[PDB]
């Protein structure tokens, strides 16, 4: 019964051709040509980095990786707290079809070993503070030939930085504005291997390309408007942080980052950077439902606060929205296996307690926990989704893949949900 399969509407903008790398390259090149355009700001150390710096360094890393010998048969790991440098190797690798496997930087050596044993990287990009953990893992994973330090300018403890690595491999006369990213089959070439013991979630470039349609959608994303600034405290190595941030770069936004939550810094950053949109997780919503300091700050530029990654009660949401003088909360629901959010609060059409509506290109249904049948409006069952951001599979684990995704393409979330007569979805429980 089609009437009971909720479908997203048409994208405000058609899906662009090209790989995720090509699409990011093209957008960032444009922003780079406007001096002073800010890509990232570190709220802790206060430093800004422009699109020109980001673009040039990401292109130089792409070419250097290529010259070192990396191609679509290789993976890299990026292991780092949120930082100005985090996205440099991500973008560089996307530019040349090298799969990127972000590794949780609070993993211990064991979860880290499990992660990198699944992703099997040739080169590991790591922050200074993760270097020891990586050296220890490398002792067991000899495929790791090269370790590069992300947040250093010079060599660091005998290891090259991104800067000296690039200088080691760039051809003479290399021109970052003549560079052309690689073109390949975006359905078959993996962009990201994200972690779910966790599994590896393989995401073709196609999925990021669909994300980039959503990100700039005036209803399901953020309208592109000059001088937009986001405050993001969510981890970049997780799908919530990874795919919001890539979308923000596509949009030319200023992404102000924190890698440690602090109440005063967070509020003062909202005020002082005139933030339009802030990204939190539900436990930080409970935090701000307790906060009394919010009204000591001028937050009149703030348009939205976004949440995802876990259940948010409608009353905690209403309390936070009210404290921040917002009409509502911008929720998103997704899994690592769906790349990004596939239910998102439509702009101007928020409903407290809802997780939003089906995004463009997707469909969602809820099925009876007994009859496996599709249910109608206001009926609770297991949420299933189908669409072009669904993972190609768990890495080297097709049994787990088959257990999650059935023959007709439906991903069975394991979450209990219902949808209402406006086609808003409510997550209500889990199996």
Residues in contact with ligand M24 by the rule CB under 6 A: 239-240, 243-244, 306, 308-311, 330-336, 340-341, 344, 355, 413-415, 427, 430
Query: Which one, 77 or 343, has the nearer CB to ligand M24?
Result: 343
Residue closer to ligand M24 by CB (options 298, 422) is: 422
- Please give the backbone phi and psi of residue 289, each rounded to the nearest 5 degrees, phi first: -70, -15
Pick 249 or 306: Cβ nearer ligand M24: 306
The H-assigned helical ranges of 120-262 are: 131-138, 162-169, 205-215, 239-251
Q: Cβ of residue 308: shortest distance to ligand M24, in angstroms? A: 2
Q: Which is nearer to ligand M24, 166 or 417 (CB)?
A: 417
> 360-371 as b/e, with b when 16 or more CB fall inside 10 Å?
bbbbbbbbeeee
For the CB of residue 337, give the shortest distance to ligand M24 in the complex, in Å: 7
The CA distance from 246 to 86, in Å, is 11
Min dist. Cβ of residue 212 to ligand M24 (A): 12
Chain breaks in the chain (C to N over 2.5 A) after: 196
* CB of 243 vs ligand M24, minimal distance in Å: 6
CB of 429 to ligand M24, least distance (A): 9
Output the smallest distance, CB 248 to ligand M24, in A. Answer: 10
CB of 411 to ligand M24, least distance (A): 10
Which residues have CB under 8 Å from 329's CB, separation 6+?
A: 304, 305, 306, 307, 312, 317, 320, 321, 345, 350, 352
Strand spans (E) along 162-210? 190-195, 200-204
Distance CA 278, CA 250 (A): 18
d(CA 286, CA 307): 11
Pairwise CA distance, residues 329 & 249, whole Å: 23
- Cβ-based nearer residue to ligand M24, 144 or 335: 335
- Residue least distant from ligand M24 (Cβ): 308
Distance CA 348, CA 304 (A): 11
- Tokens coding 261: 């939550």
Q: Determine the length of the chain.
A: 431
Q: What is the DSSP code (8-state) at residue 3?
A: G
> From the CB of 217, what's the least distance to ligand M24, in Å?
10
CB of 183 to ligand M24, least distance (A): 27
DSSP 43: T
Q: What angle do CA 21, 27, 29 make, to 5 degrees?
A: 95
Q: Cβ closer to ligand M24: 264 or 429?
A: 429
Q: CB-wise, 60 or 357, nearer to ligand M24?
A: 357
**Rounded CA gap, 42 and 255, in Å?**
9
Give the nearest distance from C-beta 416 to ligand M24 in angstroms: 9
Nearer to ligand M24, 122 or 340 (CB): 340
Cβ proximity to ligand M24, 18 vs 311, nearer residue: 311
Q: Which residue lies nearer to ligand M24 by CB, 89 or 334?
A: 334
Helix extents (H) in 252-355: 263-272, 282-290, 314-323
């Amino acid at each position: 019964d089609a009437k009971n399969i909720k479908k997203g509407p048409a994208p405000f903008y058609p899906l662009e051709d090209g790989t995720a790398g090509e699409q990011l390259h093209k957008a960032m090149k444009r922003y780079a040509l406007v001096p002073g355009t800010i890509a990232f700001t570190d709220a802790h150390i206060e430093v800004n980095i422009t699109y020109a710096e980001y673009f040039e360094m990401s292109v130089r890393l792409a070419e250097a990786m290529k010259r070192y010998g990396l191609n679509t048969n290789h993976r890299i790991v990026v292991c780092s707290e949120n930082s100005l440098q985090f996205f440099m190797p991500v973008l560089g690798a996307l530019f040349i079809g090298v799969a990127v496997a972000p590794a949780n930087d609070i993993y211990n050596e064991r979860e880290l070993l499990n992660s990198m044993n699944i992703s099997q990287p040739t080169v590991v990009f790591v922050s200074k503070k993760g270097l020891q953990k990586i050296l220890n893992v490398q002792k067991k994973l000899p495929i790791i030939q090269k370790i590069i330090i992300m947040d250093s300018k010079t060599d660091y403890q005998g290891f090259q930085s991104m800067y000296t690595f690039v200088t080691s491999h760039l051809p003479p006369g290399f021109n970052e504005y003549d560079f052309v990213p690689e073109s390949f089959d975006r359905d078959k070439t993996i962009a990201l291997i994200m972690n779910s013991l966790p599994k590896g979630v393989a995401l073709p470039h196609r999925t990021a390309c669909v994300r980039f349609s959503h990100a700039r959608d005036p209803i399901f994303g953020n309208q592109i408007i000059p001088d937009t600034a986001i405050l993001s405290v969510v981890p970049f190595h997780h799908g919530f942080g990874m795919f919001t941030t890539l979308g923000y770069l596509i949009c030319g936004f200023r992404v102000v980052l924190m890698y440690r939550f602090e109440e005063e810094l967070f509020l003062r950053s909202l005020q002082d950077y005139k933030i339009q949109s802030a990204l939190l997780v539900p436990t930080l919503f409970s935090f701000f439902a307790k906060s009394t300091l919010i009204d000591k700050y001028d937050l009149s530029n703030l348009h939205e606060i976004a949440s995802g990654g876990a259940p948010l009660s409608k009353e905690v949401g209403e309390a936070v929205a009210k404290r921040f003088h917002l009409p509502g909360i911008r929720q998103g629901y997704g899994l690592t296996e769906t790349t990004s959010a596939i239910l998102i609060t439509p702009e101007g059409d928020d409903k407290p307690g809802a997780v939003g509506k089906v995004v463009p290109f997707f469909e969602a249904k809820v099925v009876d926990l007994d009859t496996g049948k599709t249910l109608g409006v206001n009926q609770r069952g297991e949420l299933c989704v189908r669409g072009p951001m669904i993972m190609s599979g768990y890495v080297n684990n097709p049994e787990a893949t088959n257990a999650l995704i059935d023959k007709d393409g439906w991903l069975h979330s394991g979450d209990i949900a219902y949808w209402d007569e406006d086609e808003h979805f409510f997550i209500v429980d889990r199996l």
